[PDB]
Design a protein around this ligand. Structure first.
Ligand SMILES: [Mn+2]
Ligand SMILES: [Mn+2]
Ligand SMILES: [Mn+2]
Lengths: 317, 317, 317
C-alpha cells in the first residue's frame, strides 16, 4: 500500500549524547528481526542500510554544546538520505541513534513534504537551545533547531549551518512529557506548543489524548505525520535500556495505542525509533525487553493491530 | 442469594493443549483455598468435585487437531455435569483446565439456559476452526464449535459429534484480545462478533468497555451471562504461570473491574477460570501470583467488591 | 507564594500500629532530601523538626485497642504543633509516622481552619471505632475519632479525652479504597461518606475521579484541603515498604495526578505522608523506591508538575 511502504535507514550515531552507546541501536533493532518482521504484513520494506558517518577527529565543543560538528554533519547526512527515501514515496523509518539525529530526520523529511506535522513521543521536551541548555548535549536540543519560532535564539553552532528550521510551533505535539527543565518549559509555554504531558494523559486517557492530537494536527488539513518516537517515552519497566529513563511514563499499551492510531490515519510519513541503548541494560533481559518493545512499537506503526490482521483472502477455504 | 449460589466443578483436564500441565489447575486453585474463601461472603458453595475423566489410550489426531477424542469426551462429560449443576439453580464455576473445556462448559450451560450471553476474557480469540487452525490444538478452537454461524465450516471431528452449536455470533463479547491469528481475525470480522481488543480497552477505559459490553448483551433483554475467563487475558506481570502469556494485557484492576461489573448485574450464571498452569511458573512465587490473581478474580465474580462488603447487620453494636 | 509555604513537622511515631518500625519515616524521608528538594521550587520551607514524643512506660490496652495513651498523647502533641504551624500561615506537612497521627494532624489543623475538607488517600478506610475494630490497633482507627457523626459510638478511650471530632461525614473523600473490613464498610455506607474505591477509579479514570472529588469538596464553597496521604494507597509495586500493602492500587501516575490536581486548586492547607516503613522493605531497593515515591508525591503537592516548572524569568536570555 502507499502506507507501510517502508524505507529503513540505519543511523548508528551516538555523539549527540553524553558518553554514549546508543550507536548500536540499529544493530540490535535489526538483529532482533525488524525487517524480517515487517515483511509478514504487506510492507514493501527497502533497507537503505546503516548510514556511513564519516569521522570528525578534531571536534571541540562550541560553548557548552559537546561535539557539535559531528552531530551537525551526521544529521545533514541523515537528512539527505531521508529526502532520498521520501522521493521514492516511502516512509523514512530512521531507526537510531539518538534525538540528535531528529534534526536530520525531520529536516530531510521536510525538504520533500514541507507541511509535515511532528508527533514527538518523548519523556523529555528535547527543546533546549544551545544557550539555555545545561548539560550541553545535543540529544536534548533537536527541536530547537527545527522550530521557526526560535530563529535568533539559536546561535550559529558549527556544523548546523545547513539547518533551516522547518516546523512551526503549531505543527508539533508532545506526548508523554514528564521530565522538563525550566528552560524547556519556558520555551514550551511561550511558543504555545501543544503538549500532552503525563498529567494530561492521566486526565484524558490515551484514547482522548490521541483523538485530540490527531484532531489538532490533521484537523485543519490532512498532512504527513512524522512520529518521532523515543523509547524513554515509555515507562522504564518496558524500556529500561535507554539513556535517561524517567519513571511513571507511558505504558506498553499506551505506546501501542499511540502508534496504532497514528497508523490508522494512513498519513504516517516518517518514523524515528531513537535512544535504544543496549549498553545500559543491567541484565541482557532488560536489553531484550527494550528492543522487543521498540520493535513492537515500530510494527504497530505499520499496520500490526492488536485485534489481529488478515490478508484480503477467504480464510474459510 | 440467587446469585453467589455456586456449584464448583473441577476439570483437571489439559489434553486440549500442547504438552500440558494445566490439569493441576483445580488442585492449586483449591489448595489456595477457593472454597474456604468463597464461604465468608454469603455463598452457598457446593463442591461437585473434580470430574473423573476416563482415559482414551489410543486417540490419534484427526487431520492436524491433536487428540480430539479425549477433548470431545471430556467436554461432553463437563457439559453433562454443568447441566446438572444448573438444574440445581446454581452458578457453574468450572475451574480448569483449558479452554478446550469451554465447549463443554458452555454447551452444558446452554442446555438449561438457551439464551446465555458469553463474555470471553482471553488474550486470544480461541476461534480457529479445525480447518483454519495452525497448531492443531483444541485449546485454541473452543468458540468455533459453539457459534451457530460456523456450521458447515466445522468438520465432523471425532468425539465432537454431540456438539450442537449453541451461541450466536451476536451473543459473545471478547475482552482483552491482543494475540489474534489471521484466520481468527477473518472469522472475527466476518461474523460481526463484538470484540473489545486491547486497543478498544485503551481507547475507552475499562469502565466504558464494560458499560458497552453489558449494554450490548443485557441491553435488548436480560439474559444469563457466562463469563469464560482466561488467565492469559490479564497481563503476564499478574498471571505469568499460564500457557501462552501475551505481554501488554489487562491489568489486575481491570480484571477485577470486569468481574465486579459482571457480578453487579446479578445475572452471572456460569464462570470458567481456565489456563492456570502451575508448571510454567519460572519460580514458585510466579505460580503463587497467578493462582492468587485467579482466586481474586473468582471471588470478585461473587460479590467480593473492592469497596468492601458487610453483612446486613448493625455493626455499630 | 501563599501556597507552597511549607512548615515541615516530623512525627517519628509508630505506636499506633502493630509491632512497628515506621517511626523512622521522617528520618528516611528527610535523608532522601525532602527539604533540599522542596527548596528548588519557590517554597518557603521551615523545618519545625521531629516532634519529641515523651515516653509512656506503663500504658496498657483499653479493651482491645493497643497502647492508647501513647497514641493519644502523641496526637495531642502533634495537633498542638500543627496549630502552631498553621497560625504562621504555613502548610503543615506532617511526615510520619502512621495514621494514628492523623487524629492529631487533622484536629490541630481544624483548630485553625474549622471548615477544612479532608482528602484521604489510603487503601484502607481507617475508620474502625475502638468497638468495631478487630486488630485493636489505632493506625486503623483515626477517622472514627474525627467524624462528628460517630459521637457516642466512640468510647472514652484513655488519652483521647482531648479529641473533639472536627470533620463532618460530608467533608471527607476517600480515594483508593481496596481493603475495607465489614465494620468499616458499614460505617462508610451509613454515614454517606463520599468514597472513590478502586472500582470507582477504574470506572471513571483518575481524571474524572479528581474532578468529582474537588467539585464535591470545593464545589459549594472554597475551603482548605487536608490531603492525608497514605503510601499504601499506591500500588505495592511503587510503595512496597509500607505496613499493609494491598495489591492492585493507585499507580504512580495516578498518585502524582491526585497531588497535582490538589495543588492546582491552590487550597492545599495540610499534608500527611504516613506509613513509610523502611523496615518492611525486602531489599534496600524497595525502601529506596518507597521513599522516592513518597518524596515525589510530596513534591508534586507543592507545585512540581510533570509538564515542568520554570521561574518567572526570561529563559531565552
Ligand atoms: Mn527522550
Ligand atoms: Mn486464552
Ligand atoms: Mn492506609
Amino acid at each position: 500500500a502507499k502506507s507501510r511502504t517502508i524505507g529503513i535507514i540505519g543511523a548508528p550515531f551516538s555523539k549527540g549524547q553524553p558518553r554514549g552507546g546508543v550507536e548500536e541501536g540499529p544493530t540490535v533493532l535489526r538483529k532482533a528481526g525488524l525487517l524480517e518482521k515487517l515483511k509478514e504484513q504487506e510492507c514493501d520494506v527497502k533497507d537503505y542500510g546503516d548510514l556511513p558517518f564519516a569521522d570528525i577527529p578534531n571536534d571541540s565543543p562550541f560553548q557548552i554544546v559537546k561535539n557539535p560538528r559531528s552531530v551537525g554533519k551526521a544529521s545533514e547526512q541523515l537528512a539527505g538520505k531521508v529526502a532520498e527515501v521520501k522521493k521514492n514515496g516511502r516512509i523514512s523509518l530512521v531507526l537510531g541513534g539518538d534525538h540528535s539525529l531528529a534534526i536530520g530526520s525531520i529536516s530531510g523529511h521536510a525538504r520533500v513534504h514541507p507541511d509535515l506535522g511532528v508527533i514527538w513521543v518523548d519523556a523529555h521536551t528535547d527543546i533546549n537551545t544551545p544557550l539555555t541548555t545545561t548539560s550541553g548535549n545535543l540529544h536534548g536540543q533537536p527541536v530547537s533547531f527545527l522550530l521557526k519560532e526560535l530563529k535568533g535564539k539559536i546561535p550559529d553552532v558549527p556544523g548546523f549551518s545547513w539547518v533551516t528550521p522547518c516546523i512551526s510551533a503549531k505543527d508539533i505535539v508532545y506526548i508523554g512529557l514528564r521530565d522538563v527543565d525550566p528552560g524547556e518549559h519556558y520555551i514550551l509555554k511561550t511558543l504555545g506548543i501543544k503538549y500532552f504531558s503525563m498529567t494530561e494523559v492521566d486526565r484524558l486517557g490515551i484514547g482522548k489524548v490521541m483523538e485530540e492530537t490527531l484532531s489538532y494536527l490533521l484537523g485543519r488539513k490532512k498532512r504527513p505525520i512524522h512520529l518521532s518516537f523515543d523509547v524513554d517515552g515509555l515507562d522504564p519497566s518496558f524500556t529500561p535500556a535507554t539513556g535517561t529513563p524517567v519513571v511513571g511514563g507511558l505504558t506498553y499499551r499506551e505506546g501501542l495505542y499511540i502508534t496504532e492510531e497514528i497508523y490508522k490515519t494512513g498519513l504516517l510519513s516518517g518514523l524515528d525509533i531513537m535512544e535504544v541503548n543496549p549498553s545500559l541494560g543491567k541484565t541482557p533481559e532488560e536489553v531484550t525487553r527494550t528492543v522487543n518493545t521498540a520493535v513492537a512499537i515500530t510494527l504497530a506503526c505499520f499496520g500490526l493491530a492488536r485485534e489481529g490482521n488478515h490478508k484480503p483472502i477467504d480464510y474459510l477455504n
